[PDB]
Amino acid sequence: MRKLSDVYKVLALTSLKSAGFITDDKVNIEAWGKPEVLAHINEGLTRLHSRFVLRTNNCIVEMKEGRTDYPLLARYSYERFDPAKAPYPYIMDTPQEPFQEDVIKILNVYDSKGIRRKLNDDHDKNGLFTPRPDVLQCMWPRHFEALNVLYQAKHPELTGDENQEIDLPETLYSALENWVGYRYHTGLNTEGSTAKAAEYLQLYESICGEVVDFDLANGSMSNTNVLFEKRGWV
Amino acid sequence: PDGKLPFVLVPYMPRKRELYGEADAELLGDNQKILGATMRGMIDLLGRSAN
């Protein structure tokens, strides 16, 4: 689990090596292009955390009476309650692991009783529809309820602090660099730099293909066929 | 009156020069095994599919 400070250095030696903002020691990035690079790493992790299922996290959502639509934002959480934009907090997070507003796709939600509730099932009372990816529409907020919502997650936003640690598999760092190089080299609008951006972007797919061709990101899934015994079939 | 043990023993399939007899499932061994292992394979093929 590397640090953003180390990512700056490793970026300065492999991908952004001919970049202008490389400092005189060649092992760091000048303080004028760091917002630019940080805005490329954040997008880079978001893409990598979108294709592969890299971070599966669950955040429980308490039921408040009278509210059916339950946006899974950070303003409604407990530790990050924002009284100006949220009437009451209903998500539950601990101080050490607060909600980071990092929901990409919601996968499976259980209950406080252990009953699994289907997702997007038109003919299914006891079903939680999601009218938009980062929301949740429970049509019957029963008493004493909660919802462990297993969802695909993205890396928590990199504010810019050089001591924030990055959660990426070590084998996928050769693809994050090839995406930062793409974003940087494609903005210069020069013929030489643009042709390099395509090479860096295509290499991103090649490495993202070798990671999925060897199950290095846990993409293959096998499960016990519990359906067999239920449908009869002695 | 007969002055003998009051037991009468008859074999199903006699064993040569042996008091006890050999039953039917002795030769039928491994035939049930193969037939069951094939029927279970067919049922596995049908049930572990998507209909």
Residue from A35, A34, A94, A74 nearest A156 by CA: A74
- Determine which helix (DSSP H) or strand (DSSP E) holds A107, and give its type and residue range: strand A103-109
- Determine which helix (DSSP H) or strand (DSSP E) holds A44, and give its type and residue range: helix A34-51
Q: Which of residues 12-51 of B touch A (CB under 8 A)?
A: 43, 47-48
Q: Strands A148-153 and A56-60, how do they pair? A: antiparallel
Method by which the model was determined:
cryo-EM
Q: Which of residues 198-227 of A touch B (CB under 8 A)?
A: 225
Residue from A156, A208, A162 nearest A182 by CA: A208
Residue from A182, A226, A219 nearest A202 by CA: A182
B chain contacts of residue A225, beta-carbon cutoff 8 Å: 48
A137/A120 Cα distance (integer angstroms): 10
Beta bridge partners of A119: A128
Q: For residue A116, report the phi and psi dihedrals to the nearest 5 degrees.
A: -75, 135
A119/A122 Cα distance (integer angstroms): 9
Mutate: best of A222, A223, A230, A233, partner B, most B CBs <10 A: A233
* DSSP secondary structure letter of residue A171: G
A106/A132 Cα distance (integer angstroms): 10
Q: Which two tokens stand for residue A135?
A: 């929301």
A19/A33 Cα distance (integer angstroms): 10
| CB contact A233 to B (< 8 Å) | yes
The SS3 of residue A9 is helix
* CB A16 within 8 Å of CB A181: yes
Question: CA triplet A219, A220, A224: central angle to 5 degrees?
Answer: 130
Q: Is B18 exposed, middle or buried (0-12, 13-18, 19+ CB in 10 A)?
A: exposed
B chain contacts of residue A233, beta-carbon cutoff 8 Å: 43, 47
Q: Which residue of A has its CA nearest to B40?
A: A234
A101/A77 Cα distance (integer angstroms): 10
Min CA distance, A222 vs chain B (Å)? 13
Residue with tokens 């079903």: A127
What lies within 8 Å, CB to CB, of A147 at 6+ separation is: A60, A61, A63, A70, A109, A110, A111, A112, A117, A128, A136, A138
Cβ–Cβ of A228/B43 closer than 8 Å?
Answer: no
A175/A43 Cα distance (integer angstroms): 13
